[PDB]
């Protein structure tokens, strides 16, 4: 009662009883500023007119799925060294350089597929977009198996941003780039689940 406890179990029982007398939750009223977390922006909307239609995006996504099926037929049938930024740029884009034939991309493993994708984005940042480049990006994306690592998600978002940026420079819908850009954005934004970048019109 007003003795002390001689065994651990008694002490605990004694604690427990005290801990049921206490309030279970306790809030204290205080009376009276914040760091920032830098967050990567989304995709630069499309100029008026330029945004493609839902039925077109849905159309390509479906088509792109199919394309990836075929990419596994050829893939059973089996280059710069994987780390060679420069050579890979040359190899693909050249001066010309090589197209992405199934011959050659189905031979590229996933970690390479990914690295190359980086190298062609790094080219794209400081060079203009060709249709040669468009082909490779489209290819490498079709050669990306999923679920994707996050590093590789961030990659293709970078690339989808970079497209939306370049799309603002265009001055007539008759630009060769527009469709290619709208596509890549659509694919990243709908095929690879980054719908926070998608062109909802």
């Amino acid at each position: 009662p007003s003795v002390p406890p001689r065994t651990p179990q008694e002490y605990l029982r004694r604690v427990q009883i005290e801990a049921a007398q206490c309030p279970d939750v306790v809030v204290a009223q205080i009376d009276p500023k914040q760091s920032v977390n830098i967050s990567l922006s989304g995709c630069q909307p499309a100029p008026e007119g330029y945004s493609p239609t839902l039925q077109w995006q849905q159309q390509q996504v479906a088509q792109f799925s199919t394309v990836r099926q075929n990419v596994n037929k050829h893939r059973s049938h089996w280059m710069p060294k994987s780390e060679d930024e420069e050579g890979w740029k040359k190899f693909c884009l050249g001066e010309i350089g090589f197209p992405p034939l199934l011959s050659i991309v189905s031979r590229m493993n996933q970690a390479t597929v990914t690295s190359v994708l980086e190298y062609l984005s790094n080219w794209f940042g400081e060079r203009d977009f060709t249709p040669e480049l468009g082909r490779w990006l489209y290819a490498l994306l079709a050669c990306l198996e999923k679920p994707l690592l996050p590093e590789a998600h961030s990659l293709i978002r970078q690339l989808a941003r970079r497209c939306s940026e370049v799309r603002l420079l265009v001055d007539s819908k008759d630009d060769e780039r527009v469709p290619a850009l709208n596509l890549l954005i659509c694919l990243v934004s709908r095929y690879f689940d980054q719908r926070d970048l998608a062109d909802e019109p």
């Binding site: 493609p52 077109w56 159309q59 390509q60 088509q63 792109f64 394309v67 075929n70 990419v71 197209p99 992405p100 034939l101 199934l102 011959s103 991309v105 249709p131 468009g134 082909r135 489209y138 290819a139 079709a142 527009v178 469709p179 290619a180 709208n182 596509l183």
Partner: peptide, 17 residues
């Protein structure tokens, strides 16, 4: 078809209307 990607691309660019 070895260039089947290249084709599918262009088909896909082309198809914007």
């Amino acid at each position: 078809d070895d260039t089947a990607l290249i084709k599918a691309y262009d088909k896909a660019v082309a198809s914007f209307k």
